Amino acid sequence: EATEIISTLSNGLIASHYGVSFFTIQSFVSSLSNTSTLKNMLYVLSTAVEFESVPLRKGDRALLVKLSKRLPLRFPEHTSSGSVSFKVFLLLQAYFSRLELPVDFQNDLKDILEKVVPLINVVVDILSANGYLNATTAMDLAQMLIQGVWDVDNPLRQIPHFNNKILEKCKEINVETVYDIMALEDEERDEILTLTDSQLAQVAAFVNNYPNVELTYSLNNSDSLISGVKQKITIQLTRDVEPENLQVTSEKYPFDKLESWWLVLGEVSKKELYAIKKVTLNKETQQYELEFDTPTSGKHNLTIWCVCDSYLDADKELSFEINVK
């Protein structure tokens, strides 16, 4: 027999509550810019003073140098590797890559994960407050921190027990998303799901609560927009079924997490963000109002993004043209 027990799949431990220090906000503001990349953001995260509670032991540096050869993002070459920053930057990548770690590093990684959610939210808030569209790259990193995968990974890799053998069976029959899994016929699905009932229970918890949302909008008085006037927009989000709750299912993240979304209005050609609201989609249908400053006269192609903070590949977007008088 030997059932693999995963007690924190859907029943997370409670992460110790804290508020990010003003010192850390200052440091992040100094280091971030409108051109910051995913690599830059992961490095900045790693420099938080809050990680001073993460141990560094005799011999760790040499183990981390060995580990660095196996990871895709390079630590800044002009920067001391004798810091806890080096450890955090490398262990978070080992988490995304799902590499095997010795026990002491597994322990350290748990301690690191306890702190990451408030920190990545500060990154999103710094970038968005300044109107930088790269806030969306920070949101991608937020999703990676919850599911323990890379932004570029096969989205099916989030599903418990979906190993490389199962992924290739999915490729064989053009199954690409979690939604594709559920739209299949019984014989096709049964063939892919060559797992024990215990393993299937864990697949089920994930599929049950994976979000499927529909995005729509209405612009108050679209045919009469005036430059510099505060303008309201209504954004509506609908689910096919009202969710039982918003507890996140994550195999790799061991703490309790509640599902949240960012609603974003922006302009891609200008790399500009115009409005942002953090919301919880607890009902079968819901609508929200965002306020923004009407852009300059002329044509503008805008986009609304709905981006989840807890899963990959469930995001939605809509683009529309406005003509400011």
Curated annotation (Swiss-Prot):
Residues 8-322 form the SEC63 domain. It comes from the Eukaryota. Coiled coil: none annotated. It is found in: Nucleus. Present with 1440 molecules/cell in log phase SD medium. RNA helicase that plays an essential role in pre-mRNA splicing as component of the U5 snRNP and U4/U6-U5 tri-snRNP complexes. Involved in spliceosome assembly, activation and disassembly. Mediates changes in the dynamic network of RNA-RNA interactions in the spliceosome. Catalyzes the ATP-dependent unwinding of U4/U6 RNA duplices, an essential step in the assembly of a catalytically active spliceosome. Component of the U4/U6-U5 tri-snRNP complex composed of the U4, U6 and U5 snRNAs and at least PRP3, PRP4, PRP6, PRP8, PRP18, PRP31, PRP38, SNU13, SNU23, SNU66, SNU114, SPP381, SMB1, SMD1, SMD2, SMD3, SMX2, SMX3, LSM2, LSM3, LSM4, LSM5, LSM6, LSM7, LSM8, BRR2 and DIB1. Interaction with PRP8 is important for recruitment to the U4/U6-U5 tri-snRNP complex. Belongs to the helicase family. SKI2 subfamily. Contains two helicase domains. The N-terminal helicase domain has catalytic activity by itself, contrary to the C-terminal helicase domain that may have a regulatory role and enhance the activity of the first helicase domain. This is Pre-mRNA-splicing helicase BRR2. It comes from Saccharomyces cerevisiae (strain ATCC 204508 / S288c) (Baker's yeast).
